Every structure is written in structure tokens, then in C-alpha cells.
Amino acid sequence: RIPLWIVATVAGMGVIVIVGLFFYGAYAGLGSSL
Amino acid sequence: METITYVFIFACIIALFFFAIFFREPPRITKK
Amino acid sequence: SANLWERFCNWVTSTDNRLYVGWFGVIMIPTLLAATICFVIAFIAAPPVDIDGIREPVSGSLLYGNNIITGAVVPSSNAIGLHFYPIWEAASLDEWLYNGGPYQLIIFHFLLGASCYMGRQWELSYRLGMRPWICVAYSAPLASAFAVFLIYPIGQGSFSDGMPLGISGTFNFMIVFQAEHNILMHPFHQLGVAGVFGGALFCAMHGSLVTSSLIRETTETESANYGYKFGQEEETYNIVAAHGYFGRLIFQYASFNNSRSLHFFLAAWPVVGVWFTALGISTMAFNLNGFNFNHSVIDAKGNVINTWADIINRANLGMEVMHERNAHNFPLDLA
Amino acid sequence: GLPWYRVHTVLINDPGRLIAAHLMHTALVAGWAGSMALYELATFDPSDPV
Amino acid sequence: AGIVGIIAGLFHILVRPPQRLYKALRMGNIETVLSSSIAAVFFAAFVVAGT
Amino acid sequence: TITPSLKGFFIGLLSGAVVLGLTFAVLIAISQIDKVQ
Amino acid sequence: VSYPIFTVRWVAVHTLAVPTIFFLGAIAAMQFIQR
Amino acid sequence: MEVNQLGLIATALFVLVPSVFLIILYVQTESQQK
Amino acid sequence: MEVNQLGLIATALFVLVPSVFLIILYVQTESQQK
Amino acid sequence: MEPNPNRQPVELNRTSLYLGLLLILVLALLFSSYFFN
Amino acid sequence: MEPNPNRQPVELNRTSLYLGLLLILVLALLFSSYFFN
Amino acid sequence: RSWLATSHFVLAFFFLVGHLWHAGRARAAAAGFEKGIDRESEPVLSMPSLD
Amino acid sequence: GWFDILDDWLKRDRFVFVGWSGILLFPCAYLALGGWLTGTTFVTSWYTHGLASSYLEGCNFLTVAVSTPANSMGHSLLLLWGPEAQGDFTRWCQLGGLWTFIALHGAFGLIGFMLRQFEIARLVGVRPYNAIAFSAPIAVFVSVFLIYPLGQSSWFFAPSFGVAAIFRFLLFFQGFHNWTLNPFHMMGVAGVLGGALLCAIHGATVENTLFQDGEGASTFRAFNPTQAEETYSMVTANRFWSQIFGIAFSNKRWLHFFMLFVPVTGLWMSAIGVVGLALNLRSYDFISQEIRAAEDPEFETFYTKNLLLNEGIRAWMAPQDQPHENFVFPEEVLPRGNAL
Amino acid sequence: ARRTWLGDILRPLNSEYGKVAPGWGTTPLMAVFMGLFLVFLLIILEIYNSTLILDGVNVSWKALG
Amino acid sequence: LLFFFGHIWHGARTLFRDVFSGIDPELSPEQV
Amino acid sequence: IAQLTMIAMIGIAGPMIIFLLAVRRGNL
Amino acid sequence: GTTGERPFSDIITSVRYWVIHSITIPALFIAGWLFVSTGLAYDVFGTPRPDSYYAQEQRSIPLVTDRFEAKQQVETFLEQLK
Amino acid sequence: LSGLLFLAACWHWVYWDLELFRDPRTGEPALDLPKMFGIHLFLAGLLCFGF
Amino acid sequence: METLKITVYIVVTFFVLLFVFGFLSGDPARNPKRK
Ligand code: CLA
Ligand code: CLA
Ligand code: CLA
Ligand SMILES: CCCCCCCCCCCCCCCC(=O)OC[C@H](CO[C@H]1O[C@H](CS(=O)(=O)O)[C@@H](O)[C@H](O)[C@H]1O)OC(=O)CCCCCCCCCCCCCCC
Ligand SMILES: CC1=C(/C=C/C(C)=C/C=C/C(C)=C/C=C/C=C(C)/C=C/C=C(C)/C=C/C2=C(C)CCCC2(C)C)C(C)(C)CCC1
Ligand SMILES: CC1=C(/C=C/C(C)=C/C=C/C(C)=C/C=C/C=C(C)/C=C/C=C(C)/C=C/C2=C(C)CCCC2(C)C)C(C)(C)CCC1
Ligand SMILES: CC1=C(/C=C/C(C)=C/C=C/C(C)=C/C=C/C=C(C)/C=C/C=C(C)/C=C/C2=C(C)CCCC2(C)C)C(C)(C)CCC1
Ligand SMILES: [Cl-]
Ligand SMILES: [Fe+2]
């Protein structure tokens, strides 16, 4: 049994990371301007 | 002629507004 | 007389008036009446206005060649900018009408009255013992009028850049806005249409669900509306049957069963959405515009690979390049 | 009684008056056709088919 | 289509509608003939607008 | 007779029937496995 | 109760969940492509 | 100005005819005994 | 031909307006119970 | 408010409708020529 | 002849009149510009 | 100047909403109906019909 | 009978209701959404529009899109096994085959979905006013994504599935069709805007005319899920708006139908306008206005102003927006104001 | 009611009101013509859209005279 | 396009003639 | 170069000061 | 208010779920990653690589100009080292 | 033709209660839709053919 | 013209005074219950 509040907070951060990875890619990848 | 038509319709809407507000059907409770 | 003033205050505040003239009403009623009367006379008979201050009068009244769709009340001159221009600031009314005098008189009186109108939407609720916050819902459309008529001109430095009082004139404001600010590519605007689309969506949602789950009390050849009497004790529709249907359309937990949580959502969504769209105009009033993805994606050599964002930019240039023909003398549009 | 948008429901089970209705409709459509034609013939110029 | 229409016609004059269908498509209720006719009318309309 | 585009039509008409088939095949099967009353 | 495992809900859930993460992985990799 | 000649009567009938229809009904409803 | 522009709407309103008045009344009379 | 006791119902029989319409139409058939002039 | 037993009375309340008139007028205020063109 | 101006207008506005919200609640809290209309003593039902 | 056993299974009350409708809905709906999410990340629009349109190429959530096929395609259905793609998948993608894929599938998904509404309503035994309402979104999708391009030269001028790609569709209609000046569109916005008002005002009205059915401040818990008395004072709501606005509802049954009518009617009017734009039968100009503007160089309205904006939009956008035309507009022929 | 010359002659044609066939009657046979019709329409559609080309059929203002 | 709505409307009104004018009691939903 | 090491620790720190409280059970 | 399916809450909480999904979920992630990083995705959807939009000198666009011979025309566009 | 359909419309309006529309069984107004469709469809195809 | 300014100012002062002295006249009292 894994406490729900932990499941969300871990999956929560997990979402902020990957989406934040996307925002970084806006200044580096092909989606850049440099 | 056009100006007249426009103001006329407008004047009519304003006239309606009046009657709509002050000459509506009195909203009666329960026993309707 | 129990006391004239005491009686006056009791009359104003009286909840037995056909129309609740409140304390806010004491300011609202006169201001709204001046705005409307001045508007009606202008829209019909006002002479052309030199909006851009370049001695290039724009006629927007019926008697001067306009129809309802084209006709408008033209914003004050750009030569006036943000200066206060009441009638008693003009050598004559001829001058006052030429520099777009009426416009200020209207927008100021409207915004004032429309604010007190919000103030009254609290007062009456207070006098009747019901909860407030209805006025809080009205703060969203009002905050938009404020943004479009006051905040943007302040930001841009002239009331001539405020939204005109007319149909086609409203279209001009938008098209130009898009050019100078790229509003479609702005989050706050997108939240606005989301609120407006969702609004119409939920309005139809709630509307249909409820009207579809009505308890039968009417004949086959009798209006289904008569099955309701003003001032009922019990409900006129089966909200549990409504929830049962909509709960099966998508899936149960994605369906409302609490009428209070329902109507809150019904109110919260559009109000919040429009709030951002109002903040959008107020934000882009200080030139913090939408996303600029022009020439973003480029190939390995450096060639510019176009996106839809670029196709948007071409449309925008055309607006930019053509608007206010003879108003510009210098390369950059910083006004 | 009946709402304005329901006045024709008076025919849902009255085959006689329903046929009478359709007959009136058909007359109107046929009437339009003949008379719409006369309007064109009174205005059409055959002087040059090219 | 005419011949087929002639044949199909004779069919419905003779063969009766299956109970299942009569119940399903609420036959013997003229406002169901309207629903289907309208469906066909606008189908034809979309076609002539196209041609 | 029997042009390339006509052959393609049969390919799409056959691959479509298959999808309808397997779908209803599965459905009819699973349906007749549980429904007690 | 003695709940089952594989259900219609399970199927539905996976038809969206499985490709999503596969795409989220794909897109995440795109953030490092350059020129 | 240089407007449509039929614009006037088109607007006039567009207002009267359907308004007329309504009033006919309303007044006929209003006069129903009891 | 070279007729009056207002002739059409003048004739139109001359028919409708008073005819309308009548129909309004007749139908309102017709629907009186008993 | 008190229901005003001075009011009476208004009436227009079918013939009166016919007689009326006959009057309006023929008048229009008479004056239209002069309206178009 | 026998009085046809299929007829019902027709009704239009005061609000419906107002709601109606409002629709007609504003529609006229909207399309008139395009009618004059 | 753009960052500051825009940020503080958004804040200033929402705070005016917060004002209205909390001022409207306080007036109802005080008088004591911020939680709903009294089913029994419903004020409106005690006022003459304006109709 | 197997049918009734097939029926039994389908109409079983699950977490996600399937039903007969589901046999059509779920396959298309999934493919439509899936096809978009696919093209959104992987497939390009280079060979079709000379545009990058996927995450793989560097586009973001705003600029990504599933672009329309080439103008060369015409109104071709663009089947995977059709004369164009010839069974090839890669070619199919590059020729914008995913667009007709998303469009047609999504089209049937919208059919299945309303059928679901109809089917579920029947089972639960409720009125199908939810299906009637959903007709407005159908008309829109049908008129815009199908009927409109069917009147134009090809699928190319249909709205491409994407955020930004829709924004240009707006700017296009302004520049070329003068869409804002269309009476049918205006009714459209009036319905949406007016519908979003009804949504707001009614919700706010109810929440602030509620009865006290609890001792807490958060009045949400204090609601009875099992009908009985009205949770909010309809009578109080009536007298309120009657005094602030002058007019007020007094028949919940009419009030809610009204909430259905307004936004549904609006969407339908906006649809009709688009159907006319297919044949380019637009509401572009006012003849009386143009005639005066021609003879009189001092006559200026906000209407005249807007048309000049359109001229600029058309001239500056056309070259890169309609590649198939091979447009070449010299700097000197480009309509421009002063300085800018 | 009211009988008439014409009315009596037409009486038989209108009398078998509620008369239905038992069970699933001709339904399965109908479902076959339905499927044939669907394919039929799909054919002439794809021919009109030039998705189905056939040497001999030229879907243009040509092939005419 | 307009007639589409009429089809959907009358079609609905045919298959839902019983539940027309409103609905009536019971409380079943979430249990087969 | 990679200060993501920082964020990580200070990020899990937040839920930690309440997780330890779910362990020592008290005052939540 | 309930149906046959096992309450999500229980499943997302069960240790068995995570023992499964700590393997499955990252697996799909790594797979999608490889799909791009190995350049396979480029070939599956004919999407141009950063160095595959134009030829070196050419600055024109490979616009498909006819429906029936489009596929052939497209292939010809790849020929010029595009 | 319009004038004739007009006069016909009037006759069918006054003489609405023809026995032909009454079902011999129930004694109440009734129309056998399935057989009618068959009749009309036959006439349609027959006229279609001729055309 | 200088007159109009005066007139207006007086007028505006009137209503504004009516407003301030209005809410001042024990406005919280004016309500259904607790006051
Ligand atoms: C084959 C065509 C056809 C037929 C025979 C019917 C028949 C019927 N419809 Mg219907 N309908 C149709 C098409 C049709 N509809 C279409 C296409 C739509 C979508 C717009 C609708 C939408 C619709 C609704 C929403 C309702 C009906 C209702 C009804 C019933 C009562 C009609 C009534 O009293 O209205 C009388 C109507 C009036 C007195 C006002 C009409 C004013 C119109 C709008 C102005 C234009 C008039 C103009 C001359 C029309 C030209 C015709 C044009 C096609 C060329 C009746 C059975 C009603 C019903 O079922 O009752 C419960 C109902 O509520 N229909
Ligand atoms: C039931 C759900 C459903 C529906 C309605 C559709 C509908 C469609 N899909 Mg589709 N699809 C589905 C599920 C569905 N799909 C699923 C689950 C998948 C995943 C495998 C796909 C994958 C898919 C692809 C990859 C493509 C489509 C395409 C299409 C479109 C054209 C297909 C066509 O020509 O049909 C043909 C219709 C039939 C085959 C039906 C025939 C039924 C009859 C009764 C059987 C008769 C067979 C018999 C041999 C005939 C004998 C006659 C004799 C003379 C030979 C069409 C809108 C194409 C598209 O979108 O193009 C842009 C396309 O390229 N689909
Ligand atoms: C004696 C009968 C008769 C004849 C010979 C004509 C002859 C004519 N009429 Mg006409 N008309 C008639 C009666 C008749 N009318 C009646 C009674 C009406 C009132 C409803 C009209 C209303 C009318 C109008 C409004 C118009 C004409 C027009 C015309 C002319 C062109 C006809 C045309 O293009 O066909 C049109 C062909 C069709 C519409 C094809 C219909 C086929 C449908 C879609 C199929 C129906 C579904 C079917 C049941 C499916 C099963 C079939 C089965 C085989 C599978 C022509 C001179 C036109 C003209 O030029 O004006 C003078 C015109 O605009 N007519
Ligand atoms: C520069 C300063 C100018 C000063 C102007 C001169 C003084 C104002 C004179 C007003 C004369 C007109 C009377 C109007 C009567 C009436 O409104 O209803 C009459 C009712 C009946 O009560 C009323 O009537 C009662 C008497 S009786 O019933 O009417 O006989 C009375 O007892 C009670 O006190 C009273 O409330 O009055 C009210 O309900 C009070 C609210 C009145 C609201 C004013 C209009 C609101 C406008 C808002 C802005 C609109 C914008 C434009 C709209 C197009
Ligand atoms: C009786 C008789 C006769 C006579 C007859 C006649 C004379 C008839 C006529 C008829 C007619 C003469 C008819 C007409 C008709 C018409 C119509 C019917 C029309 C309609 C129209 C419409 C409906 C329209 C609509 C619209 C509009 C308005 C606008 C918008 C669009 C639309 C189109 C929608 C004779 C001697 C022979 C002999 C026998 C007896
Ligand atoms: C094409 C095609 C097909 C199909 C396929 C498919 C069906 C696929 C699917 C796919 C999919 C199905 C995918 C998915 C995806 C998803 C995603 C990718 C998502 C993302 C998301 C996100 C990113 C989120 C975000 C957010 C939000 C929105 C909210 C707020 C917050 C956040 C940020 C979290 C087939 C083969 C059949 C055939 C051929 C053609
Ligand atoms: C989604 C969701 C969720 C989740 C959420 C989350 C995921 C959250 C997170 C959160 C977090 C994640 C938090 C954190 C926090 C942290 C903190 C608060 C920290 C602080 C620290 C400090 C302040 C310190 C600093 C320092 C250092 C460390 C070194 C340098 C120096 C100094 C000392 C300054 C929930 C469950 C609610 C449910 C709903 C949904
Ligand atoms: Cl301009
Ligand atoms: Fe509600």
C-alpha cells in the first residue's frame, strides 16, 4: 500500500520535470532561433 | 430615407423596452 | 415629516421601487443618461472627426452617409492624446465636434455609470438579504470595457487609440490590434475564447440537460413550460436523472451531481476566462505582446523554414503596412 | 393552448385535412412556378444568345 | 432505377414489415415517415448542390 | 479493364470488410460469454 | 469484492496511456536535436 | 444616397408581416374568456 | 418605368396596416370562449 | 391596483372582416396608380 | 357538416409577444443595412 | 518598464476583485446571511409586489 | 438470438458506456485524435505547404499542425490505397493524407457521438434535447471543414488542424472574405457571446440566491442530491433582476430552454454564413458606399478603413500562403502607407 | 364516416393497418441490398472524385459532343 | 444543411414520443 | 554546469519535512 | 454508484501495480526516445532532417504540382539530394 | 394546375371525415403507411421509367 | 462656455455629496436582520 499523497506528489514533480524539459527545448532545440 | 428607417426601428426597440419593463405580466406566486 | 433627509434616504434605499435606485444609482442614473443621450445624438447627427489628428476627418454618423453597420462614434483626436477635453475646453461646439469631443463625454460617463451599476448589483443584494458576488461576476465584462476604453488609451498615450463606438469601428480596433500586438498568439486572449467558447458550450450543456430531464406535468398538446409555477417549493426537473444520463455520456465521476458545484462552475469558468482576456488587453496596453515565433525553426545551413506563425506574420504586416496611411512619417511605429 | 410553432400538429391524425394541406402546398409551389416563369418571360431578352 | 422502383414497389405492396422493424422504426406513426423523408430530401439537396 | 485504381478499390473494399469482420467476430463471441439474468 | 483485472476500462485506459508515454519519450528526445 | 430602391419596402415588410402575425395571436389569446 | 420610388411602399403599407388591424380584431373576436 | 370597471370587450365578425378587406384592397387598387404616378 | 374534433385553441402570451417583437426588430436593425446595400 | 507595468496592473485588478469579494462577504456576514437565505423568514416574501 | 445477446453485452452499464453507437464512435474518435497527435509530432508539411508542422522539426504546441493537402490534390479523398499514395504510407503522410484521415474519421466520430447521446438518452429514459443541442457543433464542423473547401479549389484552403494554423484561417477570412462584416457571423458571435453571458449570469445568480441548508460557510456540502425543495430562491432571483435590469425570468423551464436556444442558434447562423463563403458569396462590400468613395475623395468611414486593411492582408500574405500560384509581387506593386 | 364511390374502391388498399410480419421477417435480406447500395454509392462517388479511374470513363467536360 | 436539423428533430420526436412532455419517478441508474 | 543537483534536494526537502511527520505520526 | 471495474484508487496504490509499471512505463519512454534518436521516425513519416529541406544551392520549395503523378514527383524531389 | 389543386384542397378540407381514413377494426382514423409507401414507390418507379 | 463649466461642476458636486452623505447615514443598518 503506497499512500496516495505520495503517488500524486511524485507524479506531480514528474510532470513538472518533463514539461520543464520542453520549455528548455524552446531555447536550444530546433525550436530555437539561433 | 435610410437614416429614417434606422432611427425608426431603433425608436421602436426603445418603445418595446418600455412596455416590456413596465407593462409586463405581473409575476404571480404559487397560485398561478 | 419624520425628517426630509431621513425620508429621502429611505426612499432611495427603498426596496419597493419598480427599479432599485440605489446610492450608487444616484451617480449611475444621471451619468448613464448623459452617455446614452449624447451617444444617440452623435451616432445620428455628429459631423466627421479628425481621429488621427492629421486633419483627416472621419464621418461615422447616419446623417453623414453611414448605416448601422458602418456608423460609429469616432474617438477623440490624437492631437488631444490623453488630455481632458470637455465642452468648456473648446472655443466652440463646432471645434468640439471636430476634435472628437463627444467620445470622451460618452466613455467617461459610461465607465463611471457602468461601475456604479456594479456597485448597485451589490446594494440591492444587500437590501434583499441575499449573498453578494453577483456583482463580482459582472466585474469581468466591466473590466473589459475599462481595458478597451480606458486602459489601452492610457498605455498607448492617446484616447484616439481607444475602441470606437460602432460596429465596423470595432472591427478596425481588432484588426489593427492583431497587427501591432499579435493578440491571437497571446495566452490571456486564448484563455478568453476558452471561457467564451466553453461558456456557450456549458450554457448549452446545462440548458439542454435540465430542459431534457423535466418532470411530466403537461399535456401532449400543451406547452411543457406551463408545468412550472412561479414560486415553487420543489424542483421542476430530475437532477438525478440528468446526472444519470450525462454520467453515462462520458463517465460517472466526470459528471456533476451537486447543483451548487454545478452552478459555481457555470459562473466561474466564463468570468475567469473573460477576466484574463480583459487583463490581456490591459497587458498589451503596455506592449507586452503575444508569442513571437518568427523565423524560429531554421535548417542546418541557416535557411529560414516557415511555420504557420510566419504565415500569420505576413497577414499582420499587411495590416500594419496599410493602417493609418498618412499618419506615419518615421520607420518605427512607437505609437 | 397550442404554441404558435405547433399549430399544424392539428393534422398529425387527420388524413383528410392533411391531404387538404399538402394540396394547398402543392398548389402554391405550382403557382409560383407558372408565375415565376411569366416574370422571366416579361424580362428576358432573346436578342442575342451569344 | 425505374424498373427497380417498380419491382421494389410491388414488394412493399405485398410483403409486410417485420415486427422488429415496425416496432423499431415506430411505423404506423406518420411523424416517422417525415423523419426519413426529410433525411432523403436533404441528401438529394446536397447532391444537386454539388452537381 | 481492371485498372490499377480499381485494384486499389478492391484492396480498400476487402481490408474494410475484414475490419468489420474481426470487430463483429470478437463482439459476437465475447457477448455470448456472460449476460445472465 | 473480487475485482477482475483485464476489463473494457483497462483496454480504453491503455489505448491512450501507452501511446502517450511513448510520445512523451519521443518528444523528450527531440529537445536535444540541433544543427 | 445610392442605395437599393427595394431596400425600403424589404425592411418594411420584414418588420410588419411577422410582427403582425404575433399581435394577431397575442390579442386573440388575450380575448379568450376565462 | 419612370414611376415614384415611394409608390411601392406607400401601396404596401396602405394595404397591410389597415388589413392587419382588422385581422387582429377578427381573430381576437373568433377566439372568445362561448 | 383596482381592475378598471370601465372596459368592455371588442368585436369584429367575419363579414366585417370581409367587408373591410374589400374596402382596403379596392382603395389600394384605386390609389396605387396615383402613388406610382 | 360535423364539427371537426381535431382542433385546439392557439395561444401567445404577452412575454412571447415582447420576445417576438424584440427578435423581429433587432433582425431588421441588422439586415436593413444590407437590404439598402 | 513593460514587465513592471503589466505585472502590477494584473495584481492591482485582481485585488480590486478581492476587495469586492471580501467587502461583499463582510456586509453579509455582519448582517448575517452570508450562508444563504433563511428558508423560514425569507425577506423578499415580506415585501409588497411591485409587479 | 445472438443479436439480443450482442445487444445485452453492448448496453451493459460499465465505467465507459459502449453501446451500439460505440461501434462507430470509439474507432473513429480514437483514430481522429490519434492521427492528430501523430502528425502533430512527426509528420511534416514541407512538400504540401512548404512549412514545418511537427515537434520533430522544431515547432511548439502553438505552431504545430496537421496541414491540408496540396492544391494539386483537389478534393481527392486521399485514400492510403488511392491513386495518389498508392498504398505507400510515407508518401501518404507527405501528401497530407493525414488531413483527410482526421477530417473524415472525426466526421463519423461526431455522428457516432450524437448517436451515443440518442442511444443513452433512450435507455435512461430522458429527453434527447442533448442531441438537438449538439447539432450546432456538427453544422460548424461540416460547414467549415467540409462544405467550405468543397466550394473552393481544393482541400488546401480548409482550416488545417492546429493552433496557429487556425489563426491564419481567421486572418484569411478577414482579408479575403471580410467575414466580420457578415450578418450571419455577427449573429454567430452574438449567440456565443450572449451564451457565455447566460452561463455566467445564471451561475452567479443561483450561487448568490441560495437558501441556507447548512451551518457551514462553504455551502457546497449543504446540497440535497435527492431533489425535494429548490436549493436556491427563484422568487428572490426574480425580484432582484427585475429591479436592477428591469427584466427577469420567472420560469426555470423557459430559462433553461433559453440557455439551449441562444448558443445553438448562433452557431447555426455562423454556419450558414460559411456555406455562402464556400461559393465566395461574401458580404464584402456596400455598393452605396463604394460609389460615393469613388466620386468623393474626402469621404471616409471605418468601413472604408477596414477594406484597405484587407488589401494589405491579401497582398502581403498571398505569396507564401498560396504557393501553388507561384506569386511574384515586386516591392513597388505592394500597397503601402507612408513610412511604414 | 362518409363512404364514396372512389372511397369504396380504395378501401382495400387502406385496411391492413397494424399488420406486420412475425419475427425478423425480411430484415436479413434487406440488410444485403443495404450493403450493396452502400458499396454502389461509394463506387459512383469515388468515380466522381477521380479516386476510382476507369479507362473508358473520362470524368470531365470531355467525352462529350 | 437546415433540413439536417429538421430530420434530427422529428426523428428524435418520433423515438422519444413517450418521454415527451416530461419524465417520471424511480431511481435506478448506477446498477445493472 | 548542472545545478539540477541543487533543486532536486531542496525540492524533495519540502515533502520530506511532512513525510517524516507521517512516520512520527503527529500534528498534521 | 459502482460497477465491476476495480477502483482506480486501489490499483494506483497497490504495490503490485508499481512492481509492474516501474518496468512498463519507463520501457515505453525509452522506446519512444529511441524512435527519434535513431532517426527511424524521419523515415517512417518522410520528415526532412535539418539538412534535408533544400539542396545546397537551390532555394526553391518542393511543392507537389499534380495529384496522380505526385508520388513519382515527390521521389524526384528527394533525388536532388533533398 | 395550381387553381385545380386549390379547389381540391378545399373539398378535402370540408369533407375531411371520409371513411377511407377510418380503420374498420378500431373505428378510429388510421393510415397503413407500409402499403402506401409501396403504392407510391410503384407509381414513382413507373413514372421514372417512362421519363 | 465658462458658465457651463460652473453649472456642471455644481451639478456633479450635488450628486457626489448625495453619495457620500448617503452611505454615511447609517447604511449598514439598512438590511433584513442584524443591524
Ligand atoms: C418536410 C418539411 C417539414 C415538415 C412537413 C415539417 C412539419 C412539422 N414540423 Mg418541422 N422542421 C423542418 C421541416 C419540416 N417540418 C425543418 C427543415 C426544420 C429545421 C429548421 C424543422 C424544425 C421544426 C421544429 C423545431 C419544430 C417543427 C415542428 C413541426 C410540426 C408542427 C409545425 C408547426 O406548427 O409549425 C408552424 C410554424 C409556424 C406557424 C411558423 C413558421 C414561420 C417560418 C419559420 C417563416 C418562413 C415561412 C416560409 C414561407 C417558409 C418557406 C418554405 C421553404 C422550405 C421554401 C410539423 C409536423 C414543431 C413540432 O414538432 O411541434 C411540436 C416544432 O417544434 N419543425
Ligand atoms: C467502423 C469504424 C470505421 C469507419 C466507419 C471508418 C471509415 C473510414 N476509414 Mg477507417 N479505420 C478503422 C475504422 C473505421 N474507419 C479502424 C479501426 C482502423 C485501424 C485499422 C482504420 C484505418 C483506416 C485507414 C488506415 C484509412 C481509413 C480510411 C477510412 C475512410 C475510407 C475507407 C473506405 O473507403 O471505406 C471502404 C468501405 C468498406 C470497405 C465497407 C464495405 C462493407 C460492405 C458491406 C462489405 C462488402 C465487401 C464485399 C467483398 C463486396 C462485394 C462486392 C463485389 C462486387 C466485389 C472512411 C471514412 C482511409 C481514409 O481515411 O482515407 C483518407 C484510410 O486511408 N481507415
Ligand atoms: C403534370 C405534371 C407536371 C409536369 C409535366 C411538370 C413539368 C415541369 N415542371 Mg413542374 N410541378 C408540378 C407538375 C408538373 N410539372 C407540380 C404539381 C408542382 C407543384 C409541386 C410543380 C412545381 C414545379 C417547380 C417549382 C418547378 C417545376 C418546373 C418544371 C419544368 C422542369 C421540370 C424539371 O426540371 O424536373 C425537376 C426534376 C426533379 C425535381 C426530380 C425529382 C426526383 C426526386 C429527387 C426523387 C424523389 C425520391 C424518389 C421517390 C425515390 C424513389 C424513386 C425510384 C425510381 C427509385 C417542367 C416543364 C421547373 C420550372 O422550370 O418551372 C416552370 C421548376 O422550377 N415544377
Ligand atoms: C440634473 C439633475 C436632473 C434632475 C432630474 C429631475 C428629477 C428626476 C425626475 C424623474 C422623472 C421621470 C420619472 C421616471 C419614473 C420611473 O422611472 O419609474 C417610476 C418608479 C416608481 O417609483 C417612484 O414613483 C412613486 C410615485 S408614483 O408611483 O410613480 O406615482 C414614488 O412614490 C416613489 O418615490 C418613486 O420611487 O420609479 C422607480 O422605480 C425608481 C427608479 C427610477 C430609475 C430612473 C431611471 C434609471 C435609468 C438608469 C440609466 C438608464 C440609461 C438609459 C436607459 C435608456
Ligand atoms: C383558382 C382558379 C384559377 C386561377 C388560378 C390562379 C390565378 C393561381 C395563381 C397562383 C399563384 C399566382 C401562385 C403564386 C405563388 C407564389 C408563391 C407561393 C411565392 C412564394 C415565395 C416565397 C415563399 C419566397 C420566400 C423568400 C423570400 C420572401 C425572400 C427570402 C428568400 C425566400 C425565397 C425564402 C383558374 C382561372 C386557372 C381556373 C381554376 C380556378
Ligand atoms: C495515424 C494513424 C494511425 C493512428 C495511430 C494512433 C492512434 C496513434 C495514437 C497516438 C496517441 C494517442 C498519442 C498521444 C499523445 C499524447 C500526448 C503527447 C500528450 C501530451 C500531454 C501533455 C504534454 C500534457 C500537458 C498538460 C496539459 C495539457 C494539462 C495542463 C498541464 C500539463 C502540462 C500536464 C493508424 C496506425 C491507426 C493508421 C495509420 C494512421
Ligand atoms: C499535482 C497534485 C499534487 C502534487 C503537487 C506537488 C508535486 C507539489 C510539490 C511540492 C514541492 C516540491 C514542494 C517543495 C518545497 C520545498 C521547499 C519549500 C524548500 C525550501 C528550502 C529552503 C527555503 C532552503 C534553501 C537553502 C538551501 C537548501 C541551500 C541554499 C541556502 C538555503 C538555506 C536558502 C497534489 C498532491 C497536491 C494533489 C493535487 C494534484
Ligand atoms: Cl485604419
Ligand atoms: Fe440552472
Side-chain angles (χ1 to χ4, degrees), chain Q residues 14-81:
Chain Q
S14 70
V15 185
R16 208 254 279 95
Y17 175 94
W18 298 116
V19 164
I20 298 167
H21 298 67
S22 62
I23 314 167
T24 70
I25 295 185
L28 286 180
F29 195 97
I30 306 169
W33 186 288
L34 289 182
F35 183 52
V36 171
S37 67
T38 57
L40 184 63
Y42 283 130
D43 304 310
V44 183
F45 304 98
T47 302
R49 292 195 176 76
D51 50 52
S52 314
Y53 283 98
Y54 303 103
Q56 192 53 53
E57 289 317 275
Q58 170 203 46
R59 208 167 308 177
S60 170
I61 277 175
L63 197 68
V64 177
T65 62
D66 77 285
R67 60 180 291 178
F68 298 131
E69 288 298 293
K71 172 184 170 65
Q72 176 60 71
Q73 180 168 37
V74 171
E75 256 128 54
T76 314
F77 282 148
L78 285 327
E79 287 303 316
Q80 20 148 23
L81 297 181

Side-chain angles (χ1 to χ4, degrees), chain F residues 12-13 16 20, chain M residues 24 27 31 77-81 92 100-101 105 108:
Chain F
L13 187 58
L20 293 173
Chain M
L24 177 62
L31 267 23
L77 295 155
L78 268 188
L79 272 33
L80 169 72
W81 58 90
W92 189 61
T100 51
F101 180 81
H105 275 67
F108 283 107

Side-chain angles (χ1 to χ4, degrees), chain E residues 2, chain R residues 45-51:
Chain R
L46 180 52
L47 186 58
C48 182
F49 173 75
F51 178 60

Side-chain angles (χ1 to χ4, degrees), chain C residues 9-257:
Chain C
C9 296
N10 281 246
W11 165 70
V12 173
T13 206
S14 170
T15 70
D16 296 327
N17 289 321
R18 178 60 190 77
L19 299 171
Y20 179 61
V21 49
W23 275 133
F24 280 104
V26 178
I27 299 297
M28 180 184 80
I29 300 174
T31 56
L32 284 185
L33 281 189
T36 183
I37 289 182
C38 183
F39 175 78
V40 172
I41 297 176
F43 189 88
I44 297 189
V49 169
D50 181 36
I51 178 165
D52 304 327
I54 57 169
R55 315 306 175 77
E56 190 187 302
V58 179
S59 77
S61 81
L62 302 181
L63 286 178
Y64 281 72
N66 283 266
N67 57 23
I68 304 294
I69 304 299
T70 70
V73 171
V74 184
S76 61
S77 173
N78 183 62
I80 300 170
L82 290 183
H83 283 220
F84 192 62
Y85 197 64
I87 306 181
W88 63 80
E89 194 83 342
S92 50
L93 282 167
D94 272 31
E95 166 194 314
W96 185 71
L97 302 167
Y98 183 90
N99 293 252
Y103 183 78
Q104 281 189 38
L105 191 153
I106 305 179
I107 60 161
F108 292 152
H109 283 74
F110 170 75
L111 286 174
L112 205 63
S115 299
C116 294
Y117 185 90
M118 179 170 68
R120 211 177 62 148
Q121 292 202 320
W122 157 81
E123 198 174 319
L124 186 57
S125 86
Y126 187 59
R127 314 298 193 219
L128 295 185
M130 45 180 273
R131 322 180 66 197
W133 304 334
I134 278 187
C135 70
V136 162
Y138 175 72
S139 81
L142 181 56
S144 300
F146 261 89
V148 130
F149 290 145
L150 174 72
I151 304 306
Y152 193 64
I154 291 170
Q156 295 298 109
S158 165
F159 283 104
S160 69
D161 258 358
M163 180 186 90
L165 306 186
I167 312 295
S168 295
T170 301
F171 303 152
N172 192 281
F173 182 77
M174 293 190 270
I175 300 186
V176 177
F177 205 91
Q178 171 57 35
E180 308 202 305
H181 298 295
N182 196 21
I183 187 172
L184 294 177
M185 291 297 273
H186 196 294
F188 280 8
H189 177 271
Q190 296 167 303
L191 282 175
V193 3
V196 164
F197 276 172
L201 202 184
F202 301 143
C203 178
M205 271 285 84
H206 187 82
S208 65
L209 260 43
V210 169
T211 198
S212 63
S213 63
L214 295 180
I215 313 169
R216 172 192 328 182
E217 279 114 351
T218 66
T219 332
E220 182 67 25
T221 49
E222 165 186 294
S223 162
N225 272 1
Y226 281 87
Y228 177 86
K229 291 301 165 189
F230 180 61
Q232 272 187 184
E233 282 74 13
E234 19 64 83
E235 189 48 65
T236 191
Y237 80 100
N238 209 317
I239 191 164
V240 190
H243 171 54
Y245 163 76
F246 183 59
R248 291 180 159 68
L249 192 59
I250 318 300
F251 68 87
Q252 195 187 351
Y253 306 95
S255 176
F256 277 147
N257 64 81

Side-chain angles (χ1 to χ4, degrees), chain C residues 172 323-324, chain M residues 305:
Chain C
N172 192 281
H323 84 294
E324 312 202 304
Chain M
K305 280 174 150 287

